[PDB]
Write a protein that binds this ligand. Structure first.
Ligand SMILES: N[C@@H](CCC(=O)N[C@@H](CS)C(=O)NCC(=O)O)C(=O)O
Ligand SMILES: N[C@@H](CCC(=O)N[C@@H](CS)C(=O)NCC(=O)O)C(=O)O
Lengths: 220, 220
């Protein structure tokens, strides 16, 4: 039976789980949290170990914590490397992706007075810290994939971040030719291609009225 | 050969790696970052994939990202559950530990005007969200360990957080008798006992002059 994704109708912290399950060719369904009363039903059901989402129902568990869900999907569907040494590289790479993701993820709820400086810090970190590091990985081995010459979650998570970087400012990708080639190849895996095509589960970026909706339901 | 831990002489993000390696009975050494020039040497050496610490040299890798290092230690030393289903529970539990840890970890750099409210939010989340959740896990199975009736990193990470909670306010543990019993049993594993005893690698809590030292080296 298909996993069931419980979240808001939006990217938030569920978006990387959509990408990873899509890349694994796993068909899923979503129950959207449309109102406060929807969130309150999940809590009063005892479905949420920490009273939070994302929550995914898979293989008879109600899994919360984005990283717990991702770790379980990657391992079940052979996207977590061949051995614990490849896993160490994959984790080091995707934890770097996660830190830059987090800065972009919190932009919409940044006091608008400190938003410019926060956008400058993101552009600086993208061009001077993260993307040069992943570019050097691809430069060092010349293979099509970040780890083990084989598709992993690291490729999937990095390519999702490269799309977010391009949405923020396309010039940020200009000096990273190997990352652009990675983004083109991963986008063309049959599973990911359907995910990005019209009718795919890929969520649109927020607007100011969409962040408003999420700020009254979770109230953060 | 023993792993080499690169960090500041303090808890920060390296403290859970000290606990986990100690619990596994793995002897380690530390190279402390005492000055800006120490941090600059690690960066200019190309040792830090993302120009950050923690960094651990283990089995011929220079691993950065706290979670990558932890994941690799837990898996190598049999503290990550017997199967990917136990791993899903362990990850869900320790990601909840990580969120409450993070709130306590950022207290020292909280604008003092918003610190009281942030301390209230931590006490509220500790007593109403996190500790009731882990108490219920122990209540549901009556076993000595959180997962699989066997020592895992989940026990180690939760017991480190229970000590941090007790340092902040000992009354927070009052209504959690099973968590107190867990803390007493895990504290008495021979490896963890040496870690907590005088001469152990366990780091003291910060003071106002210690956070000052770290704020000029990393400048955050
Ligand atoms: N560390 C968690 C974070 C979960 C989280 O922050 N969820 C938010 C929505 S994005 C939430 O449920 N907020 C409601 C609350 O905390 O009361 C994860 O990675 O899954
Ligand atoms: N997500 C990383 C965070 C690493 C981190 O924030 N390190 C800080 C010190 S605690 C640092 O090196 N700051 C220097 C900088 O970012 O320039 C992890 O979990 O290891």
């Amino acid at each position: 039976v298909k996993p069931m994704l419980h979240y808001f109708n939006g990217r938030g912290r569920m978006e990387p789980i959509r990408w990873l399950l899509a890349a694994a060719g796993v068909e899923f369904e979503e129950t959207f949290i449309d109102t406060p009363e929807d969130f309150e039903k999940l809590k009063n059901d005892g479905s949420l170990m920490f009273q939070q989402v994302p929550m995914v129902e898979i293989d008879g568990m109600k899994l919360v914590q984005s990283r717990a869900i991702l770790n379980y999907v990657a391992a079940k569907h052979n996207l977590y490397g061949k051995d614990i040494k490849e896993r160490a590289l994959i984790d080091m790479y995707i934890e770097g992706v996660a830190d830059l993701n987090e800065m972009i993820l919190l932009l919409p709820i940044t006091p608008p007075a400190e938003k410019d400086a926060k956008i400058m810090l993101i552009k600086d970190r993208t061009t001077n810290r993260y993307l040069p590091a992943f570019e050097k990985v691809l430069k060092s081995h010349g293979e099509d994939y970040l780890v083990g010459n084989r598709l992993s979650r690291a490729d999937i998570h990095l390519v999702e971040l490269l799309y977010l970087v391009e949405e923020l400012d396309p010039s940020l990708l200009t000096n990273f030719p190997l990352l652009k080639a990675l983004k083109a190849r991963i986008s063309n895996l049959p599973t990911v291609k359907k995910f990005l095509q019209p009718g795919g589960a890929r969520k649109p970026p927020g607007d100011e009225k969409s962040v408003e909706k999420s700020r009254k339901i979770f109230k953060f």
